[PDB]
Amino acid sequence: MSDLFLELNGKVHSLSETFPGLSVQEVSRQSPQLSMETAEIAGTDGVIPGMTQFKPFIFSAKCNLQALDIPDYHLAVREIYEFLFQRDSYYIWSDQMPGIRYEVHPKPVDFSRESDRVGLLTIEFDVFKGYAESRGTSLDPMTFEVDLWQMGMNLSNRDDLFYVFRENTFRVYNAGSDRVNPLMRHELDIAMTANGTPTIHNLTTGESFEYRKELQKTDVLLLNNIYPLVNNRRVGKDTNHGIITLEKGWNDFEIKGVTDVTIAFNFPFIYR
Amino acid sequence: ITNNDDLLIFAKKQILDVPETALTIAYKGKEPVSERDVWYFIHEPMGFETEVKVTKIKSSHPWSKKFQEIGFSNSRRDMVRIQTQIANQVKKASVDTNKINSFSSIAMNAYDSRILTEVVGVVDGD
């Protein structure tokens, strides 16, 4: 059996449960849409490629509707059209891979009316961010409690994955399929509380962020996206405008210039 | 000038009694063309059999595969040339009026000295 779960407006619905006549037959996804810009030079062979990107891709679900009668068929068609086509994006996942969800927008779908009560259809969804993601952020207990398989072992059972640290040097595990970069409009929050002048060094990626003012324990420094804040106030003028990115796997972090440091990382994993 | 022969040669230089023509050729041969060489142009359908002196070249890189554009007997009209001519004429007029303002002021300045001379002579005559 198969099903499709849709999270929208803060509620989780089952496609086979919201519409009793609807039954999901098969679920599949398109390949990553690698896009690349090529430049040609006269007198030389081949092309020079620019930086590669990943265009939005398509998540498809082929299903059928078995209505009770013709009025039920029309009512179910209208209900499905009303439910699926909202004005804002929403998340979807499947029972086959419950640990990974896609933030999608619906695509036009045509009902193939085979009989007076039976209609086949294929619901397609545009994943417009170009990647999938975990069901929650790193700090979310939801993420590490359903399932997550990466090159063989389930990450929901590993006990060495921590994202809140109290020491000055530690390691952070990014389990995604590629690096997490706030410059790429990714989600990444870093919250610190310490005393002194903070300085964060990501030795794995060789990045650094420094705040050039004294800090106190009750003052929280939050780096969200490309913006640093102190007590929910933009303080970018007093920093080096550094951006901290997490590479694939283990990243070694060193905190210097402060004591009694408590640092937490909150970010979702990115899957290709 | 004051004599008539200089005026005659100036007047001869002042007009153009032949149609103003400009020739453009798209050349795609192997032999390179320099800025000084004079070529021989033969083009039967357009009735050309003459010697042409290069006055404008728009060459491409030797690896660019593109054609070459070569001009003879001055260039086509174009607007940016007209704008440059208008701008330089404007600058010449501006410097002319700037000079003539000072010239007129000096003419006023040169008047007061002669006024003083007239006054001194009037006093002397009395």
Q: What is the DSSP string of chain A?
A: ---EEEEETTEEEEHHHHSTTEEEEEEEEPPPEEE--EE--TTSSS-EE---EEE-EEEEEEEEEE-SSHHHHHHHHHHHHHHH--SS-EEEEESSSTTEEEEEEE-----EE-SSSEEEEEEEEEETTSSEEEEEETT-TTTTTS--EETTEETTS-S----EE-SSEEEEEE-SSS-B-GGGT---EEEEEEEEEEEEEETTTTEEEEB-S-B-TT--EEEETTEEEESSSB-GGGB------B-SEEEEEEEEEEEEEEEEEE-EEEE-
> Which A residues in the span 228-267 are in contact with B, Cβ-Cβ below 8 Å?
none
Residue length, chain B? 126
Nearest CA in chain A to B63: A43
Q: Does the beta carbon of A108 lie under 8 angstroms from any beta carbon of chain B?
A: no
Structure tokens that stand for A32 in this block: 């990553």
> Of A223, A218, A193, A229, whose CA–CA distance to A208 is shortest?
A223
C-alpha distances out from residue A200 to A149, A176, A190, A241, Å:
31, 22, 11, 12
Structure tokens that stand for A14 in this block: 């089952």
Q: CA-CA distance, A26 to A33, in Å (whole number)?
A: 22
Q: Does the beta carbon of B40 lie under 8 angstroms from any beta carbon of chain A?
A: no
Q: Does the beta carbon of A43 lie under 8 angstroms from any beta carbon of chain B?
A: yes
In chain B, which residues have their Cβ closer than 8 Å to the Cβ of A43? 61, 63-64
Bridge partner list, A95:
none
> Of A71, A91, A96, whose CA–CA distance to A21 is shortest?
A71
Q: Does the beta carbon of A45 lie under 8 angstroms from any beta carbon of chain B?
A: no
Q: At what resolution in Å was this solved? A: 2.9
In chain A, which residues have their Cβ closer than 8 Å to the Cβ of B61? 42-43
Q: Does the beta carbon of A42 lie under 8 angstroms from any beta carbon of chain B?
A: yes
In chain B, which residues have their Cβ closer than 8 Å to the Cβ of A42? 61, 63-65
In chain A, which residues have their Cβ closer than 8 Å to the Cβ of B60? none
Q: Does the beta carbon of B64 lie under 8 angstroms from any beta carbon of chain A?
A: yes
Q: Does the beta carbon of B61 lie under 8 angstroms from any beta carbon of chain A?
A: yes
Q: Amino acid identity, residue B126? A: D
Nearest CA in chain B to A42: B64
Q: Does the beta carbon of B114 lie under 8 angstroms from any beta carbon of chain A?
A: no
Residues 6 or more apart whose Cβ sits within 8 Å of residue A118: A64, A65, A66, A67
In chain A, which residues have their Cβ closer than 8 Å to the Cβ of B65? 42
Q: CA-CA distance, A14 to A74, in Å (whole number)?
A: 21
Q: Does the beta carbon of A183 lie under 8 angstroms from any beta carbon of chain B?
A: no
Cβ A110 vs Cβ A121: under 8 Å: yes
In chain A, which residues have their Cβ closer than 8 Å to the Cβ of B67? none
In chain A, which residues have their Cβ closer than 8 Å to the Cβ of B63? 42-43
Question: A42 vs chain B: nearest CA distance in angstroms?
Answer: 6
Interface A–B counts its CB contacts (< 8 A) at 7
Cβ A76 vs Cβ A19: under 8 Å: yes
Q: Does the beta carbon of A40 lie under 8 angstroms from any beta carbon of chain B?
A: no
Nearest CA in chain B to A40: B64
Question: A45 vs chain B: nearest CA distance in angstroms?
Answer: 12
User: By what method was this entry solved?
Assistant: cryo-EM
First-to-last C-alpha distance (Å) of chain A? 26
In chain B, which residues have their Cβ closer than 8 Å to the Cβ of A40? none
Q: Does the beta carbon of B63 lie under 8 angstroms from any beta carbon of chain A?
A: yes
Structure tokens that stand for A42 in this block: 């006269």
In chain B, which residues have their Cβ closer than 8 Å to the Cβ of A45? none
Q: CA-CA distance, A98 to A199, in Å (whole number)?
A: 38
